[PDB]
Design an enzyme around this catalytic site. Structure first.
Site, mmCIF file in Angstrom:
data_model
loop_
_atom_site.group_PDB
_atom_site.id
_atom_site.type_symbol
_atom_site.label_atom_id
_atom_site.label_comp_id
_atom_site.label_asym_id
_atom_site.label_seq_id
_atom_site.Cartn_x
_atom_site.Cartn_y
_atom_site.Cartn_z
ATOM 1 N N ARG A 78 41.465 33.183 66.585
ATOM 2 C CA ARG A 78 40.916 34.232 65.814
ATOM 3 C C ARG A 78 39.515 34.529 66.055
ATOM 4 N NH1 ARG A 78 43.643 29.642 64.601
ATOM 5 N NH2 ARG A 78 45.523 30.163 63.565
ATOM 6 N N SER A 147 40.936 23.017 68.308
ATOM 7 C CA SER A 147 41.844 22.159 67.522
ATOM 8 C C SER A 147 42.434 21.172 68.557
ATOM 9 C CB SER A 147 43.180 23.105 66.964
ATOM 10 O OG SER A 147 42.547 24.289 66.440
ATOM 11 N N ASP A 200 39.742 21.664 63.932
ATOM 12 C CA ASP A 200 40.089 22.507 62.971
ATOM 13 C C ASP A 200 40.275 21.684 61.451
ATOM 14 O OD1 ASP A 200 42.246 21.390 64.103
ATOM 15 O OD2 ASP A 200 43.617 22.704 63.879
HETATM 16 O O1 LIG Z 1 46.483 21.612 64.960
HETATM 17 C C1 LIG Z 1 46.065 20.530 64.198
HETATM 18 C C2 LIG Z 1 45.784 19.357 64.922
HETATM 19 O O2 LIG Z 1 46.707 19.007 65.971
HETATM 20 C C3 LIG Z 1 46.411 17.862 66.832
HETATM 21 O O3 LIG Z 1 47.362 17.782 67.538
HETATM 22 C C4 LIG Z 1 45.152 18.066 67.600
HETATM 23 O O4 LIG Z 1 44.966 17.252 68.491
HETATM 24 C C5 LIG Z 1 44.079 18.016 66.347
HETATM 25 O O5 LIG Z 1 42.894 18.089 66.965
HETATM 26 C C6 LIG Z 1 44.118 19.189 65.476
HETATM 27 O O6 LIG Z 1 43.348 18.751 64.395
#
Ligand SMILES: OC[C@H]1O[C@@H](O)[C@H](O)[C@@H](O)[C@@H]1O
Length: 465
Positions: A78, A147, A200
């Site tokens: 986004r 993320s 995230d």
């Molecule tokens: O997508 C939400 C989560 O997925 C996990 O696999 C990622 O490694 C995390 O960093 C993320 O917070």
């Protein structure tokens, strides 16, 4: 026929290996807490990395100005833009644009990926915009939600540890993801500075406390799963340096990597992992998260097709193809309440390419979804409980006495759009807690939480220009 009992033999072992008796959930919750402590003293190869986020102060409300955020997830990204106006007016204007990540960019070069992102940002920034203003002669500052697990080095710098979910891009581990994003932006070339880099989960917890001051942790249940919480800096042995004025530190648990011999896994789980893009990693997450549930169901349905001729006397070809059954398709079948499972039947026709299905077969399919969705949601609840244990918030004072109010921020399509998952999650969480402590715990959807959250942290960390 006699198929019927060969089918029951398969379903019986599923129920049997996926069983999560609350007694087992309390033990898993204790195991999660032990790993949170193993991670906080930086024990070698601890499953939970418990990454220090460099966020010592969460949003207050008194943020003001124009700030962007870039939100890179496992499936979409986004471009956000907000105009803050203090404790009173808060978010005066919001603009956002969301783009699906083309599948090849999850497994190509890092320049290909960040060039794609940066180019979407460059053109979004040019749609600005009368409602957002930046003083004359100033740089625009950005919040970066990433993320994936990052070893942080400052509020705005950090090294990539490994990819997860469906990403696997060579040459990016060990490198600074903000530096990688900044060269993409100069190749664009837009004058923008990243002032906050956050995961995230950490961003969701920021965006969540901006609206409710009682938020103590954030859990993502989406295409992946992970959690972050507010820890006391003096409870982090691996900490070096001066502690923060606030005494707190937001920790990215990276709990998808949780592994434990108490986790109820099956051969379907080993097979999924043996063929995953990151074998051996993120064991817990593959029992819970949206990237994986549909594929567990396909793999259970395929054993029934073969050992019980459940879908015909020949196995449908599409049923042997990995990832053909996604988790939204699972969710659509699981919520069908028509007397003859009419919709679940229509989905099975599309997904397996059969012409029709039995009605016994649809009830078994619906039972297979229930077994899978519920082991994932019950385990996710055990994790949330572990976080509460670690905050001493699984207990209620004591004399009795004022009870605390402790809010958990949640985001992700699993929690937001998979209704039986969310329900099973909250009932199990409530049941692990007690009619008592339960009344003090809140679970909120904190939609699009990571982005504003990043935008807000990018602000409290501005170069004031
Ligand atoms: O997508 C939400 C989560 O997925 C996990 O696999 C990622 O490694 C995390 O960093 C993320 O917070």
């Amino acid at each position: 026929e006699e198929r019927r009992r060969r089918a029951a033999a398969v379903i019986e072992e599923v129920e049997q290996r996926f069983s999560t008796p609350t007694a087992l959930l309390r033990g898993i919750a204790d195991a999660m807490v032990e790993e949170m402590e193993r991670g906080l003293r930086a024990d070698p190869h601890a499953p939970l990395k418990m990454l220090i986020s460099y966020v010592d102060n969460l949003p207050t409300g008194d943020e003001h100005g124009l700030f962007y955020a870039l939100d890179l997830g496992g499936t979409n990204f986004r471009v956000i833009r907000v105009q803050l106006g203090g404790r009173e007016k808060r978010v005066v204007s919001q603009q956002y644009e969301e783009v699906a990540i083309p599948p090849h960019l999850m497994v190509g070069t890092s320049m290909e990926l960040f060039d794609f992102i940066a180019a979407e940002l460059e053109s979004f920034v040019k749609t600005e915009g009368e409602d957002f203003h930046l003083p004359e002669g100033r740089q625009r500052e950005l919040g970066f939600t990433f993320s994936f697990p990052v070893h942080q080095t400052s509020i705005s710098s950090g090294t990539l540890i490994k990819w997860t979910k469906g990403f696997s891009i060579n040459g990016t581990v060990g490198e600074d993801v903000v530096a990688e994003l900044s060269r993409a932006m100069e190749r664009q070339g837009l004058d923008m500075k990243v002032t906050a880099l956050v995961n995230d989960t950490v961003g969701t917890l920021a965006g969540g406390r901006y609206v409710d001051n009682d938020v103590a942790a954030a859990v993502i249940l989406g295409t992946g799963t992970n959690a972050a919480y507010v820890e006391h800096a003096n409870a982090i042995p691996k900490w070096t340096g001066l502690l923060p004025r606030s005494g707190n530190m937001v920790i990215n648990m990276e709990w998808g990597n949780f592994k434990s011999e108490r986790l109820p896994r099956s051969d379907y789980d080993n097979a999924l992992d043996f063929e995953s893009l990151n074998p051996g990693e993120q064991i817990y997450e593959k029992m819970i998260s949206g990237m994986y549930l549909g594929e567990i169901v396909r793999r259970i349905l395929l054993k029934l097709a073969h050992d019980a001729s459940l879908f015909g006397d020949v196995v449908p070809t599409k049923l042997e193809q990995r990832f053909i059954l996604r988790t939204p398709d699972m969710s659509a079948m699981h919520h069908d309440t028509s007397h003859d499972l009419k919709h679940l039947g229509a989905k099975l026709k599309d997904i397996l390419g059969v012409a029709d299905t039995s009605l016994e077969a649809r009830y078994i399919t619906l039972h297979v979804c229930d077994l899978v969705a519920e082991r994932g949601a019950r385990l996710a609840a055990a994790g949330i409980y572990g976080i509460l244990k670690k905050l001493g918030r699984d207990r209620v004072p004591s004399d009795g006495s004022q009870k605390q109010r402790t809010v958990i921020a949640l985001d992700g399509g699993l929690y937001e759009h998979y209704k039986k998952f969310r329900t099973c999650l909250e009932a199990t969480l409530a049941d692990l807690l007690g009619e008592e402590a339960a009344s003090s715990v809140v679970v909120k959807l904190a939609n699009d939480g990571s982005g504003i959250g990043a935008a807000l942290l990018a602000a409290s960390h501005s170069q004031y220009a």
